[PDB]
Amino acid sequence: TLTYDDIVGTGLANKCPTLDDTARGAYPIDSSQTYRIARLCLQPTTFLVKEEPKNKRQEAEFVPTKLVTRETTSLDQIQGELKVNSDGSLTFVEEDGIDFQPVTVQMAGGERIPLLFTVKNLVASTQPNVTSITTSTDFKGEFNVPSYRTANFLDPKGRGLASGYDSAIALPQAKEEELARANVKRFSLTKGQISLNVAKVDGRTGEIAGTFESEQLSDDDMGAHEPHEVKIQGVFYASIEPA
Amino acid sequence: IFGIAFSNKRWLHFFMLFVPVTGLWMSAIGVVGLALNLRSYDFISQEIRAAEDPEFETFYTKNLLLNEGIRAWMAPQDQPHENFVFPEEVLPRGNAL
Amino acid sequence: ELVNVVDEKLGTAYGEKIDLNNTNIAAFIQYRGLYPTLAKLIVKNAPYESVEDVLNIPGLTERQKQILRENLEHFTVTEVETALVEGGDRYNNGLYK
Amino acid sequence: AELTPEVLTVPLNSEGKTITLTEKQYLEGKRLFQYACASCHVGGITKTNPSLDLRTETLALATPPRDNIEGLVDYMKNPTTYDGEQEIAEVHPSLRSADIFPKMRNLTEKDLVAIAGHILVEPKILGDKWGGGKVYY
Amino acid sequence: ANLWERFCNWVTSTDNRLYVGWFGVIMIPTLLAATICFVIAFIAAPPVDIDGIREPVSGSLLYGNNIITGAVVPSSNAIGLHFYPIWEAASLDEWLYNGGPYQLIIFHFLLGASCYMGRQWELSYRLGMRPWICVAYSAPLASAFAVFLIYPIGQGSFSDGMPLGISGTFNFMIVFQAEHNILMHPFHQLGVAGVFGGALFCAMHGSLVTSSLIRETTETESANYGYKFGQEEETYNIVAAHGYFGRLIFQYASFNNSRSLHFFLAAWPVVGVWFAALGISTMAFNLNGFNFNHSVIDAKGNVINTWADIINRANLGMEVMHERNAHNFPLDLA
Amino acid sequence: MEPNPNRQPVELNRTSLYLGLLLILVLALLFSSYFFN
Amino acid sequence: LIYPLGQSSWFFAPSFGVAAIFRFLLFFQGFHNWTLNPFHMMGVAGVLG
Amino acid sequence: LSYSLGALSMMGFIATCFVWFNNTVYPSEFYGPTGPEASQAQAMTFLIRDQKLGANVGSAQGPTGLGKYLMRSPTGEIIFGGETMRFWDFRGPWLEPLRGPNGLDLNKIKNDIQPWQERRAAEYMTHAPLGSLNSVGGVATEINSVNFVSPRSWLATSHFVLAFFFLVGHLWHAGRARAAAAGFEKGIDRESEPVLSMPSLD
Amino acid sequence: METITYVFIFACIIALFFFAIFFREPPRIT
Amino acid sequence: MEVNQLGLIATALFVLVPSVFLIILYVQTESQQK
Amino acid sequence: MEVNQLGLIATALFVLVPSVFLIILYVQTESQQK
Amino acid sequence: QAWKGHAVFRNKEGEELFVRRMPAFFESFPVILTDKNGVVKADIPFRRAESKYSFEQQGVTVSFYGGELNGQTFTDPPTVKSYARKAIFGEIFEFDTETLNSDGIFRTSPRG
Numbered sequence A: 001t002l003t004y005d006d007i008v009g010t011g012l013a014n015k016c017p018t019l020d021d022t023a024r025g026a027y028p029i030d031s032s033q034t035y036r037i038a039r040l041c042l043q044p045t046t047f048l049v050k051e052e053p054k055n056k057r058q059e060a061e062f063v064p065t066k067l068v069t070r071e072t073t074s075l076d077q078i079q080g081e082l083k084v085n086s087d088g089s090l091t092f093v094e095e096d097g098i099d100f101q102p103v104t105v106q107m108a109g110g111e112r113i114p115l116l117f118t119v120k121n122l123v124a125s126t127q128p129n130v131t132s133i134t135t136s137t138d139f140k141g142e143f144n145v146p147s148y149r150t151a152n153f154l155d156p157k158g159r160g161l162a163s164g165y166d167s168a169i170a171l172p173q174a175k176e177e178e179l180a181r182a183n184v185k186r187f188s189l190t191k192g193q194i195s196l197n198v199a200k201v202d203g204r205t206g207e208i209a210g211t212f213e214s215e216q217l218s219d220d221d222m223g224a225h226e227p228h229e230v231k232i233q234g235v236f237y238a239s240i241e242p243a
Numbered sequence B: 001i002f003g004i005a006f007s008n009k010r011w012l013h014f015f016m017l018f019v020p021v022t023g024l025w026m027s028a029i030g031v032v033g034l035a036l037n038l039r040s041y042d043f044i045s046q047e048i049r050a051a052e053d054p055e056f057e058t059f060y061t062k063n064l065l066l067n068e069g070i071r072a073w074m075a076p077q078d079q080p081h082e083n084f085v086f087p088e089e090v091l092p093r094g095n096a097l
Numbered sequence C: 001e002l003v004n005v006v007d008e009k010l011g012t013a014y015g016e017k018i019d020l021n022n023t024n025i026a027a028f029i030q031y032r033g034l035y036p037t038l039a040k041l042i043v044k045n046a047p048y049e050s051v052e053d054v055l056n057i058p059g060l061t062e063r064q065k066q067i068l069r070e071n072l073e074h075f076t077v078t079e080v081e082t083a084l085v086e087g088g089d090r091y092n093n094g095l096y097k
Numbered sequence D: 001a002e003l004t005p006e007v008l009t010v011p012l013n014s015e016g017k018t019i020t021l022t023e024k025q026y027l028e029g030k031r032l033f034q035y036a037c038a039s040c041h042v043g044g045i046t047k048t049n050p051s052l053d054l055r056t057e058t059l060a061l062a063t064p065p066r067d068n069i070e071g072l073v074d075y076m077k078n079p080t081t082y083d084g085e086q087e088i089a090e091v092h093p094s095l096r097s098a099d100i101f102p103k104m105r106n107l108t109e110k111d112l113v114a115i116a117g118h119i120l121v122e123p124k125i126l127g128d129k130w131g132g133g134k135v136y137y
Numbered sequence E: 001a002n003l004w005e006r007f008c009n010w011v012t013s014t015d016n017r018l019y020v021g022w023f024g025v026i027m028i029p030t031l032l033a034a035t036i037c038f039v040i041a042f043i044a045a046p047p048v049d050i051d052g053i054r055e056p057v058s059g060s061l062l063y064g065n066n067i068i069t070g071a072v073v074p075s076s077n078a079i080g081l082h083f084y085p086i087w088e089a090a091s092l093d094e095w096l097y098n099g100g101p102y103q104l105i106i107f108h109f110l111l112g113a114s115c116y117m118g119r120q121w122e123l124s125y126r127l128g129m130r131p132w133i134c135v136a137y138s139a140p141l142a143s144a145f146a147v148f149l150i151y152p153i154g155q156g157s158f159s160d161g162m163p164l165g166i167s168g169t170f171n172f173m174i175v176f177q178a179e180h181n182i183l184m185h186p187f188h189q190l191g192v193a194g195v196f197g198g199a200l201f202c203a204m205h206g207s208l209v210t211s212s213l214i215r216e217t218t219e220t221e222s223a224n225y226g227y228k229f230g231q232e233e234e235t236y237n238i239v240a241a242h243g244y245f246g247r248l249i250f251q252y253a254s255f256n257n258s259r260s261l262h263f264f265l266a267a268w269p270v271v272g273v274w275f276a277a278l279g280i281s282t283m284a285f286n287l288n289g290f291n292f293n294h295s296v297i298d299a300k301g302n303v304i305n306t307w308a309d310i311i312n313r314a315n316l317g318m319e320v321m322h323e324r325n326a327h328n329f330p331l332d333l334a
Numbered sequence F: 001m002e003p004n005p006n007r008q009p010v011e012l013n014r015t016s017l018y019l020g021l022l023l024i025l026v027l028a029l030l031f032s033s034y035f036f037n
Numbered sequence G: 001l002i003y004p005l006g007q008s009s010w011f012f013a014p015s016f017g018v019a020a021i022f023r024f025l026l027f028f029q030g031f032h033n034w035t036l037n038p039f040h041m042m043g044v045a046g047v048l049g
Numbered sequence H: 001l002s003y004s005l006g007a008l009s010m011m012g013f014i015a016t017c018f019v020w021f022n023n024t025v026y027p028s029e030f031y032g033p034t035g036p037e038a039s040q041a042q043a044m045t046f047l048i049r050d051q052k053l054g055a056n057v058g059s060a061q062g063p064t065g066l067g068k069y070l071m072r073s074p075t076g077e078i079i080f081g082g083e084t085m086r087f088w089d090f091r092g093p094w095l096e097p098l099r100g101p102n103g104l105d106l107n108k109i110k111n112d113i114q115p116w117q118e119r120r121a122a123e124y125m126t127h128a129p130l131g132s133l134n135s136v137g138g139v140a141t142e143i144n145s146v147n148f149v150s151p152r153s154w155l156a157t158s159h160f161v162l163a164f165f166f167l168v169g170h171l172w173h174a175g176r177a178r179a180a181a182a183g184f185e186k187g188i189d190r191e192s193e194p195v196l197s198m199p200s201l202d
Numbered sequence I: 001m002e003t004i005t006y007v008f009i010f011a012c013i014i015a016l017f018f019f020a021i022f023f024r025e026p027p028r029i030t
Numbered sequence J, K: 001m002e003v004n005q006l007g008l009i010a011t012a013l014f015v016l017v018p019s020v021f022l023i024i025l026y027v028q029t030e031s032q033q034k
Numbered sequence L: 001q002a003w004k005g006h007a008v009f010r011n012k013e014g015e016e017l018f019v020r021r022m023p024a025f026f027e028s029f030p031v032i033l034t035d036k037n038g039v040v041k042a043d044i045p046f047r048r049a050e051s052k053y054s055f056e057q058q059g060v061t062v063s064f065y066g067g068e069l070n071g072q073t074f075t076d077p078p079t080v081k082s083y084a085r086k087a088i089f090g091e092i093f094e095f096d097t098e099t100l101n102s103d104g105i106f107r108t109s110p111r112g
């Protein structure tokens, strides 16, 4: 059993727990029992960004990127209700946890793409009649993506939404109109989508692991520019419990 | 050690006069400009870029934020004849502080 | 046409009263008996369609209900503003003294 | 301007009674406030919870009221949250928790009165500076 | 001689145009690495997240800076005092984002400049000189250590090291004033006496030697030709110089001993600058300038401001505005 | 060092300076319109 | 002399005092951005040089 | 003497760092909190305060996008946020009970913080080793009131100054010992000036 | 164009260092 | 008029560089011993 | 970046004019009789 | 190009408010409006969370007398704020910034 001193500085703290190859069982759902996910962990392994269409207006592709913010990317210690629905589907209702990470990835050529990688307010559901969670179970749902910066954030010229100057004070007599988009900060709130694909189940412990893919918008710099579309792929771990 | 060296003592000692004397004279010229508020306050190209691009930041833009704090926080007590009253809500401050 | 949503909110009742749906929790220190116990319950159980709905929070004591009734005249409700409630800002909005 | 008997006259209770502190009590109050309280309450603010200050208007709206000698002396024995709802001796210096806040061990009833009087007199001298924080420095 | 013996003879050779020596064996590669990285970073480095808040600051010329605004930006606050060599990053792109060039540069520089100091001792020894030029150089060197290493150590981050740039230097100074009231610190005051006095005595010595040059030339030529490199006789009249300066003030305030005078010239700026360095190096552990905020109080207890309180208001402006998105809690504790 | 015997002095007389300056100035007068375009 | 003469009054000259002079330095930073001035920069090089 | 001056200088700088960072052989009970300790204690204090008020401190996004109270270190460990991100290597008896395998544990934070931890964090936050030369406690802009400079600051600064001057003494005496041994500590022999027998550099 | 200018001046200064050191007028004892 | 913004420095350097070359050569010819 | 369009010529002439003055003087010194 | 006219600011109660003018020392200056006796009545806040004097709260309006805007009144906070920002400079003018590609930053005159 590993301690903090065993883990510190290794990179392991940013990894989700894994289950070994023998974990191909089934976890029974008693539809009379209430359930929780006691720990949901999401470890991203790839960030893909949709290239901005040249103007050909064909299918713009999601391209690889380089992570520049180090091993600071995973979502973990997330908990919430696991409802059993009348049609036998399960719905996870995210309540709390370390459910976001600012992440900066870099495109070929240098463009840096910050995003708030998140599952905030995740509501994810399985297919109907899931009498047991098995390696055939999947969860699909949506989450909230709030502005990457919150309302106090001040730009390099001191301008902000809930604080800061409301004008370009270094250009006292410039015409305001051309600068409105930079001067007037806006707070973004959009939706993301995620699929959780169960690959491993320990029937005895209630532990499941698999792969995920999420799609969401990146940072829009408080309304100063257009966000990019991001696709995040990785592994996940969850512990299901009666509660 | 350094690649060059004095070889002429008369030059060496004249240079010792020249350097600090010339420095002080230069600083005086700048202050004559400041008498008129004729400052090197800004780089215009910097400001035009930063006004349009909220992700553009340099140590130059950072120092102006400090200057704006100095001005707002010190002026009412430093310039009492102006009778400045700056309500709490107008004072420039970053997060928390 | 771009709007600063916080400035705009200041022209509503949010700028006049404690908005049970938006105002940061320290605002409840303004009135006797509200902080921290009721303040916590109010923020935790927001949003409210009307001010009186604050009386419907489960577990309240009769004393607590009466304090709430005496303080409804100091409360308002407006639409939830994402910019004011994200970031856990209702609990800590980056303002100290 | 002087530190007059009137400046030194503060509310004893919520029932209209006042007490006039002596100059020596004022000095003792400053000293004892510095000794036991100023590490968190310098200048009338509160470092570990800036939402709550020691301004007289703030103390008046506390439950029970704390804008008088009795209210403050009681606070120093049995501190509560601002609504009176929980007793916080376990995390706030008090006579009741002198075991865990050892600086409270040598404070006498007379000392508490002096500290209380300091808290009430100081804003009468300093105005907005008391509980104002850095803005008013 | 074998190869090692020959190599040693060349390294320590008094005949090399630039002295190498054993300190130089470390100095040369470290200073070259620091110089090359600095030049490339100053021209071409992308923005750096100095304060670890995903708010990259542009330091390089190609990314919108001029000579005055440009810098190599300190490494990320997320790194702190962690050692961040290139090989600890997953890629050069990550290394650059997090301010890796700053650490590479300042560590090679500090090593190289320390060896520069040793090398000064070393050559003085080979030439049969007295050894203490290197002790004079310890003053600027100590100052560089203070701003690039000791201050970061005390505050817990290389993100608080002085940036390698003109405007970044001013940023460091202003924030230092806010956080330590350095102007009110006696070690910085000794530093000012050291450099103002150094300049004064530099001009003084220059002017007095120049004033008493012995006539060896005509008016149509520089008086500098009146001195020949390596001549045995002194080129000015120290007796006339002392005769002048002793009357300017009074006899006993003037030096008649050149060795004493030149020692004073060495000692005044060096000692002052040692105190400057020690000011930074001790404010690194937050023993700060004198604090007379509200020191003067009237009979009632009204605060009567002094100039110290006006300084305080300026400092507050700096404090509240610096790193405007980095603080979440009410006190700036490092 | 032992001196290099291949060294020669270089000259430009006044007439050649005047001819050269004329060439350069007239070329500038001619090409400048195309530089500004 | 020249500096206050260009300003509103002698009030803005330096006051003769240690802390007062420090105030004068910080005023020049906040109001004039005097560190950015190449004439001050040449002064610094001549003093430090 | 010079060898010993060099050694003592080295020891001086080590002692400076020992008293600045170490809280084992320099117990914070006696010496006050370390700089790293007090900064972490501040983050702990406000996490406790705001969580009592109902904040979910794990999911609270700060103005920059990083967690207001909690974030990841560059290797992923859960650490306090704000400027104290730099101090995540700090370890102390009042904080460690909240530490799990992956760093600060959110379930422990939500459920297991004891009043003695709140008190200690508040104490350390308000006895940070910052103060003026005349012993006015706190930040440089703080008003007179609290007579405090941490023993950690007194001990670190004094020993840096001492270590520095001892390095100078080392250089002074090492350089002099060399020159005296070789016989030129009093100056160059006018009739045997070494440079005069050396070939010109150019 | 600005960047080119700054780098150009810097490069000239570095070249100047080279000449000032290796191609200085040699100091001669008379 | 919308002229090429490099025309000014192009013309200036076109004139100055070769003119200076010639002036250098002329003056050092004059200063040679007669 | 929106720089001053005269900054390039200003900088170039600031360098070239005095540098050229010095080179002229240096070279004609060298060419004088030894 | 033209004087816009004299801007008169009023709050919801109809009291005349006066914008505090920028002194020459200041490159930037806050927007603070007082009544005739110097009491603060409205401002443009930096921090909004504890704002009490915002133009939105105080119902600040601006009416113009003389110049191009003579007889006009604006009540929408963005526009009223915009004119208040210009009032710190004193009388308000319309400028052609296009002809010279003017950058919005003050320069001295031949006197300076």
Ligand code: CLA
Binding pocket: B023, B024, B027, B028, B029, B031, E173, E195, E196, G024, G025, G026, G028, G029, G033, G034, G035, G040, G043, G044, G047, G048
């Ligand atoms: C690297 C740090 C640094 C350095 C080396 C300098 C260096 C300089 N600064 Mg700058 N400064 C700095 C940082 C620095 N500054 C920063 C970060 C700021 C913030 C913007 C400033 C703000 C600043 C201001 C506002 C001014 C300077 C000025 C100066 C110059 C002062 C010259 C002088 O000696 O005047 C000292 C005074 C004199 C030489 C006048 C004559 C004095 C007589 C002879 C005294 C006689 C005394 C007598 C015998 C009696 C003594 C009695 C005793 C009891 C006291 C000098 C070039 C000044 C300058 O530019 O002036 C033109 C100035 O006004 N600086």
Ligand code: CLA
Binding pocket: E025, E026, E027, E029, E030, E033, E083, E084, E085, E086, E087, E103, E104, E105, E107, E108, E111
């Ligand atoms: C004089 C040569 C020299 C020296 C001293 C350094 C030193 C350094 N390099 Mg640099 N480097 C050099 C030349 C040198 N470099 C050259 C020529 C290149 C081009 C290939 C580079 C390219 C380079 C890169 C890309 C990087 C460095 C980095 C570093 C740092 C860490 C090195 C390390 O981890 O070694 C570990 C080695 C040891 C601990 C040696 C132990 C073995 C000995 C025998 C034991 C005794 C040593 C002991 C500590 C005491 C010293 C003895 C003393 C008492 C006399 C350090 C500042 C890194 C950096 O700057 O990080 C921020 C980094 O990323 N270097």
Ligand code: CLA
Binding pocket: E026, E111, E114, E115, E117, E118, E119, E121, H002, H003, H006, H007, H009, H010, H170, H171, H173, H174, H175, H177, H178
């Ligand atoms: C600023 C650092 C510094 C400098 C410039 C010097 C300079 C000098 N030393 Mg001292 N020394 C120092 C620190 C220093 N010392 C310290 C801290 C100690 C205590 C351990 C000593 C112990 C010492 C002894 C025992 C002796 C000297 C001696 C000398 C003199 C003769 C040359 C020599 O043998 O060097 C030796 C150099 C050192 C011991 C340290 C030099 C440190 C610098 C920074 C170079 C580091 C190079 C290193 C290989 C790079 C590490 C890279 C890393 C990434 C692996 C010369 C004046 C000799 C002398 O003649 O005394 C009378 C002698 O016998 N020194």
Ligand code: CLA
Binding pocket: E271, H133, H135, H151, H154, H155, H158, H159, H161, H162, H165
């Ligand atoms: C390691 C050395 C050291 C350290 C860390 C301390 C620490 C402390 N002392 Mg102790 N003490 C010391 C040595 C030390 N002392 C010595 C040598 C004496 C005999 C004089 C004393 C006698 C003493 C008394 C009587 C008292 C203290 C007190 C205190 C506290 C307040 C200090 C203060 O206000 O400073 C004020 C700061 C100064 C006076 C400035 C000192 C600056 C010096 C002069 C600069 C040194 C530079 C360098 C060494 C010189 C080299 C010159 C160069 C050219 C070569 C503090 C905890 C007080 C206390 O609180 O007790 C409970 C107290 O009342 N100390």
Ligand code: CLA
Binding pocket: H008, H009, H011, H012, H013, H014, H015, H016, H018, H019, H155, H156, H159, H162, H163, H166
């Ligand atoms: C003004 C001069 C001055 C003063 C007042 C001090 C004072 C102090 N120094 Mg500093 N020091 C100085 C100059 C000074 N120093 C200089 C010039 C240097 C070299 C640069 C140092 C290097 C230095 C270091 C490296 C350290 C100190 C430390 C200390 C402190 C503890 C001293 C100690 O216990 O020594 C140790 C005592 C001895 C060596 C004497 C023998 C002690 C015996 C072995 C003790 C046995 C105890 C044992 C329990 C017995 C029990 C019996 C059992 C059978 C029952 C003390 C505050 C320490 C500290 O606190 O730093 C932060 C420390 O680590 N000093």
Ligand SMILES: CC(C)=CCC/C(C)=C/CC/C(C)=C/CC/C(C)=C/CC/C(C)=C/CC/C(C)=C/CC/C(C)=C/CC/C(C)=C/CC/C(C)=C/CC1=CC(=O)C(C)=C(C)C1=O
Binding pocket: B002, B004, B005, B006, B007, B018, B019, B020, B022, B023, B026, E038, E039, E040, E042, E043, E067, E165, E166, G041, G042, G043, G045, G046, G049, I006, I007, I010
């Ligand atoms: C990639 C890119 C572009 C990188 C560049 C980035 C970057 C930040 C570049 C820096 C830009 C830069 C240089 C900025 C500074 C600009 C600036 C402020 C310039 C000042 C200009 C100026 C005219 C100022 C006026 C005041 C003035 C005249 C100052 C001169 C200062 C000066 C040169 C002093 C001398 C310094 C010095 C090292 C002297 C050494 C002398 C020497 C060899 C002594 C040794 C010696 C001593 C003896 O006693 C004896 C007996 C002998 C025999 C002997 O030998």
Ligand SMILES: CC(C)=CCC/C(C)=C/CC/C(C)=C/CC/C(C)=C/CC/C(C)=C/CC/C(C)=C/CC/C(C)=C/CC/C(C)=C/CC/C(C)=C/CC1=CC(=O)C(C)=C(C)C1=O
Binding pocket: E201, E204, E205, E206, E208, E209, E238, E241, E242, E245, E246, E249, E253, E254, E255, E256, E261, E264
């Ligand atoms: C209308 C009426 C009443 C008229 C009456 C007028 C009248 C006749 C008066 C007579 C009566 C009378 C005398 C009254 C006095 C009144 C009075 C006390 C006025 C006060 C004046 C005043 C403010 C004086 C301040 C004192 C002062 C000038 C102090 C500064 C001097 C000082 C501290 C010097 C020491 C500094 C120092 C160590 C310098 C050495 C460093 C240095 C210059 C090295 C360079 C150097 C030095 C050499 O040494 C030589 C050799 C060479 C080579 C060389 O490089």
Ligand SMILES: CCCCCCCCCCCCCCCC(=O)OC[C@H](CO[C@@H]1O[C@H](CS(=O)(=O)O)[C@@H](O)[C@H](O)[C@H]1O)OC(=O)CCCCCCCCCCCCCCC
Binding pocket: E190, E191, E193, E194, E195, E197, E257, E259, E260, E261, E263, E264, E267, E268, E269, E271, E272, E273
């Ligand atoms: C009330 C307080 C209680 C007391 C406490 C004591 C505190 C310790 C005091 C420190 C003692 C200092 C001793 C000085 C000895 C010395 O230097 O001798 C060396 C020579 C000997 O003098 C020369 O002396 C020679 C003879 S001999 O060498 O002495 O034999 C002679 O030939 C020559 O003409 C003469 O100039 O001194 C000089 O060259 C002239 C004096 C120069 C001043 C030295 C101080 C260093 C600079 C000041 C530091 C800067 C501080 C300001 C920051 C910017």
Ligand SMILES: CCCCCCCCCCCCCCCC(=O)OC[C@H](COP(=O)(O)OC[C@@H](O)CO)OC(=O)CCCCCCCCCCCCCCC
Binding pocket: B001, B002, B003, B004, B005, B006, B007, B008, B009, B011, B012, B015, E018, E224, I010, I013, I016, I017, I020, I021, I024, I027
């Ligand atoms: C370890 C190896 C380190 C090598 C590093 C390279 C060092 C370069 C040293 C400067 C060379 C250029 C000197 C030209 C000028 C030159 O050739 O000087 C040579 C000159 C020789 O003096 P003499 O006494 O011999 O000459 C006197 C007679 O000729 C009278 O006319 O030296 C001085 O004048 C010393 C004072 C000037 C000191 C200037 C130092 C400036 C430092 C550089 C600052 C610029 C920074 C810009 C950064 C972008």
Ligand code: OEX
Binding pocket: E051, E077, E155, E159, E160, E175, E179, E322, E323, E326, E332, E333, E334, H083
């Ligand atoms: O990083 Mn650069 O400056 Ca030293 O204090 Mn805390 O941290 Mn941040 O604030 Mn203030």
Ligand SMILES: [Ca+2]
Binding pocket: A135, A136, A137, A197, A198, A199
């Ligand atoms: Ca599957």
Ligand SMILES: [Ca+2]
Binding pocket: L097, L101, L102
């Ligand atoms: Ca335009």
Ligand SMILES: [Cl-]
Binding pocket: none
């Ligand atoms: Cl309040």
Ligand SMILES: [Cl-]
Binding pocket: B062, B063, B066, E171, E175, E321, E322, E323, E324
């Ligand atoms: Cl800053």
Ligand SMILES: [Cl-]
Binding pocket: E326, E327, E328, E329, H081, H082, H083, H084
């Ligand atoms: Cl913080």
